[PDB]
Amino acid sequence: RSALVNSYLWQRWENWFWNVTLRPER
């Protein structure tokens, strides 16, 4: 419950989602 806690928690959820959705291979 903080301005720098939920934002970091949400940012991490998308960071992982993009990490596997993007996959810069080749």
Swiss-Prot record:
Glycans are attached at residue 19. Its cofactor is Zn(2+). It is a multi-pass membrane protein. It is found in: Host endoplasmic reticulum membrane; Host lipid droplet. Activity of protease NS2 is dependent on zinc ions and completely inhibited by EDTA. This is probably due to the fact that NS2 protease activity needs NS3 N-terminus that binds a zinc atom (active region NS2-3). Cysteine protease required for the proteolytic auto-cleavage between the non-structural proteins NS2 and NS3. The N-terminus of NS3 is required for the function of NS2 protease (active region NS2-3). Promotes the initiation of viral particle assembly by mediating the interaction between structural and non-structural proteins. The N-terminus of NS3 is required for the catalytic activity of protease NS2. The minimal catalytic region includes the C-terminus of NS2 and the N-terminus NS3 protease domain (active region NS2-3). Homodimer. Interacts with envelope glycoprotein E1. Interacts with envelope glycoprotein E2. Interacts with viroporin p7. Interacts with serine protease/helicase NS3. Part of the replication complex composed of NS2, NS3, NS4A, NS4B, NS5A and the RNA-directed RNA polymerase embedded in an ER-derived membranous web. Part of the viral assembly initiation complex composed of NS2, E1, E2, NS3, NS4A, NS5A and the core protein. This is Protease NS2. It comes from Hepatitis GB virus B.
